[PDB]
Design a protein around this ligand. Structure first.
Ligand SMILES: C[C@@H](c1nc(-c2cnc(N)c(-n3nnc4ccccc43)n2)nn1C)N1CCOCC1
Length: 819
């Protein structure tokens, strides 16, 4: 029955479906019904896809942004495998051909009927791409390991697709009636400041309430300096309740128009949110804690059925100098703004990419000016992805503006969308109504690609404990589940594994105080070996990456760590995969993993940007994913250790040698020079990464080394210099770069070049970083709160020559400070 699926979605999304009904809201009812059909349409289209098209949905290719190698190939229903010697320039088809020919001669006798599955992973190799373009092959060629693949036939992929089925007339000013208030605070008098906003900008000057002593009654008329006909569609009425002899108490906002474009009237009770003065960026929906939250009773006076005019009507109304207009194009005065508005047609024709600057000069408090702009917009050419990401910020609130940005993001690759998905999910907080183009797009892309679908779910699910977004986020996940009954069940398994891990972590935390670690470890081990634990912790997709399969839990290899939140070290094995199935996951409960994930995503973007310029600084883009309330996962980077642990053996005469001696033991003979190259490149990338991102409090316990020599960072506590952090250079690292030699300028000057190139490449994309950090402000991160945080990134990135010289000033100060 359908009831079991409804109860399944409920337990999964972490909110009962009945709770959407209890509210008795037609906006919630319309979102649910409309979006459900949209997702069921998307689910249907998927079931009739060709086997390759389905493989592109389920297991999208892991691609990279000559030489011969041994590759092991086996067929689905057999233990028999053949090891072939193929090239890195060879296409998957030639490998499939070899695999077929060898099967035909052994068993005594077409490659376009198969696909190559990565052993013990939900990863596949297909398409006209040389084998060296696939991430699994590339990880194998660097680690030395042999790629193990499985020949999967069309009819078997088709069996999966089958078992995975389911107006202008009102010229009087805008006014309201502030009736009465409620709840606590000191003696003093309560003022209610009220303003009207279109994004970050006021449509008129604020009007404050008359001073009333502490449950208060106002019954006062508040009028605004704006005509009702001049109100923009996305106008926000913002309130702030505070005390004065200031002390802020509460805040609440609301759209003057509903989801059906109707100008509201009638009384309204406003369950306000506790303050840290006016917050326009805040949610336009009341506090769900209607019991303990302060309420503002207000009245929307009648003006009578007034609906915001249709596009056909907006377009009906909307239907040199030239030199100084270019000079201001590459924070501006009023005469400069008037010039841009006068020249608005020349902006569309010769500077389409300057649209954002034009959208900020338009008087949104004048319907005629809005119409004249919307008319230009309804003929405006598509903007590049970069400029479109700027148009998603709270500074651009108009619905038609918002719809144009999505229209420019449709061209985005599933790879590019994956990179900025964290920012696009945050932008959901800025949205005014449940039903939006952003949700329809995010949902459309989730259901068209199972990896986008996976991460969109976890981005939403991880924020379910946040009351301001719980309804929106819950509604989106339920809409998703209707479009994928099978994936819903897959994500449910993941939630059961994480449910067991929290209980096991709670036990560990308690036990670590009551007894010694070897005694707590055997108890963890004993608790894990219980039926329910063995079942729940095994045979699941990794929330860190759906292509990674967590098969049998290796209880003996599991442990906990000695740090504050006693994190769990959970290891896995798989016979099929061999070594690819020997993965590990770290479960952390107690700290906020959101920032660590962002820091790692920003470093992952830097890697992508460098790799695109041919520069491979041998980075370690390991997974970090918040899954719940101060709960998350970290990807285990195997064959790695901390600097502090390496600096103590289980032989060095001096500390400076310890690091180099460890590399010497893990990379003997001709391999050592490779490990030092890995160290030099990775070190340089993380020197530019930590510097630009403003990562301080870096020490031996949070910096790690792989047995390959690759250096990487962990447990990023504070970013954007939020303790102006300088460049960091360590004697122990410089020693390794300089090959143990006290003096080595060739090796050090090469390393100085890597730091320089890495820095200059990122400076060219400085706008990409600034747009993504701007969009990220929505998340609520105490380290990305204001413009001074954006300004940190502006200063660490800063003409190319006048900035590169200034980088050398910081680089030289870092080398001299090194003892
Ligand atoms: C020394 C230490 C060890 N840690 C790692 C390792 C690997 N990958 C990571 N992503 C990683 N990170 N990253 N963020 C973290 C946050 C907390 C803890 C760990 C973290 N830590 N490897 N090893 C051997 N323990 C030896 C005994 O067994 C338990 C592990």
């Amino acid at each position: 029955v359908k009831k079991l699926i409804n109860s399944q979605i409920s337990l999964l999304i972490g909110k009962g479906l009945h709770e959407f009904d209890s509210l008795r809201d037609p906006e919630v009812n319309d979102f649910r019904t409309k979006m459900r059909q949209f997702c069921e349409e998307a689910a249907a289209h998927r079931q009739q896809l060709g086997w390759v098209e389905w493989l592109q949905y389920s297991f999208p290719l892991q691609l990279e942004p000559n030489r011969a190698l041994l590759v092991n190939v086996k067929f689905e229903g057999s233990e028999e495998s053949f090891t072939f010697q193929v090239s890195t320039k060879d296409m998957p088809l030639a490998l499939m051909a070899c695999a077929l020919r060898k099967k035909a001669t052994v068993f005594r006798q077409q490659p376009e009927e198969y696909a190559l599955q990565v052993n013990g992973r939900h990863e596949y190799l297909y398409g006209n791409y040389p084998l060296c373009h696939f991430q699994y092959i590339c990880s194998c060629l660097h680690s030395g390991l042999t790629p193990h693949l499985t020949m999967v036939h069309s009819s078997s992929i088709l069996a999966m697709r089958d078992e995975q089925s389911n107006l202008w007339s009102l010229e009087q000013p805008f006014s309201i009636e502030l009736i009465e208030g409620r709840k606590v605070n000191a003696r003093m008098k309560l003022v209610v400041q009220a303003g009207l906003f279109h994004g970050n900008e006021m449509l008129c000057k604020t009007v404050s309430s008359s001073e009333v002593n502490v449950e208060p009654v106002w019954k006062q008329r508040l009028e605004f300096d704006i005509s009702v006909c001049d109100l923009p569609r996305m106008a926000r009425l913002c309130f702030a309740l505070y005390a004065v002899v200031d002390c802020p108490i509460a805040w609440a906002n609301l759209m003057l128009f509903d989801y059906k474009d109707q100008l509201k009237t009638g009384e309204r009770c406003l369950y306000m949110w506790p303050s840290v003065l006016l917050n326009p960026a805040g949610t336009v929906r009341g506090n769900p804690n209607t019991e303990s939250a302060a309420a503002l009773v207000i009245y929307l006076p009648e003006v009578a059925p007034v609906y915001f005019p249709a596009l056909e009507k907006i377009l009906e109304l909307g239907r040199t100098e030239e030199e100084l207009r270019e000079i201001l194009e590459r924070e501006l005065y009023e005469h400069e703004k008037d010039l841009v508005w006068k020249m608005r047609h020349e902006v569309q024709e010769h500077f389409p990419e300057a649209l954002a600057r034009l959208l900020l000069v338009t008087k949104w408090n004048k319907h005629e000016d809005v119409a004249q702009m919307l008319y230009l917009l309804c003929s405006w050419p598509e903007l590049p992805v970069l400029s479109a990401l700027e148009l998603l910020d709270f500074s651009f609130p108009d619905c038609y503006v918002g719809s144009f940005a999505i229209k420019s993001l449709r061209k985005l690759t599933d790879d590019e969308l994956f990179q900025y998905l964290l920012q696009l999910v945050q932008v959901l907080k800025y949205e005014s109504y449940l039903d939006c183009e952003l949700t329809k797009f995010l949902l459309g892309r989730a259901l068209a690609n199972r990896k986008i679908g996976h991460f969109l779910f976890w981005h939403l699910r991880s924020e379910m404990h946040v009351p301001s977004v719980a309804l929106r986020f819950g509604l989106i996940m339920e809409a998703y589940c209707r479009g994928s009954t099978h994936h819903m069940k897959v994500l449910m398994k993941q939630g059961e594994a994480l449910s067991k891990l929290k209980a096991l972590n709670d036990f560990v935390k308690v036990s670590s105080q009551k007894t010694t670690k070897p005694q707590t470890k055997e108890m963890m081990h004993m608790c894990m070996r219980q039926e329910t634990y063995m079942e729940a912790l095994s045979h699941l997709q990794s929330p860190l990456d759906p292509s990674t399969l967590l098969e049998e839990v290796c209880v003996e290899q599991c442990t906990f760590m000695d740090s504050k939140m006693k994190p769990l070290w959970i290891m896995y094995s798989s016979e099929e995969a061999g070594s690819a199935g020997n993965v590990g996951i770290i479960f952390k409960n107690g700290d906020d993993l959101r920032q660590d994930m962002l820091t790692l995503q920003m470093i992952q973007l830097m890697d992508v940007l460098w790799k695109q310029e041919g520069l491979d600084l041998r980075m370690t883009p390991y997974g970090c994913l918040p899954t719940g309330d101060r709960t998350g996962l970290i990807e285990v980077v195997l064959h790695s250790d901390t600097i502090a642990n390496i600096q103590l053996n289980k032989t060095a005469a001096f500390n400076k040698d310890a690091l180099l001696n460890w590399l010497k033991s893990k990379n003997p003979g001709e391999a050592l020079d490779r490990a030092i190259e890995e160290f030099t490149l990775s070190c340089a990338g993380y020197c530019v990464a930590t510097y630009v991102l403003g990562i301080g409090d870096r020490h031996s316990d949070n910096i790690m080394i792989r047995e390959s020599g690759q250096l990487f960072h962990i447990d990023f506590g504070h970013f954007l210099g939020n303790f102006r952090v300088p460049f960091i250079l360590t004697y122990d690292f410089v020693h390794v770069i300089q090959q143990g030699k006290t003096n080595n300028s060739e090796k050090f000057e090469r390393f100085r070049g890597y730091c320089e190139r890495a820095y200059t490449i990122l400076r060219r994309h400085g706008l990409l970083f600034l747009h993504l950090f701007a969009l990220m402000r929505a998340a609520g991160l105490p380290e990305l709160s204001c413009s001074k945080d954006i300004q940190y990134l502006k200063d660490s990135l800063a003409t190319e020559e006048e900035a590169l010289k200034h980088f050398r000033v910081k680089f030289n100060e870092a080398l001299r400070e090194s003892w």
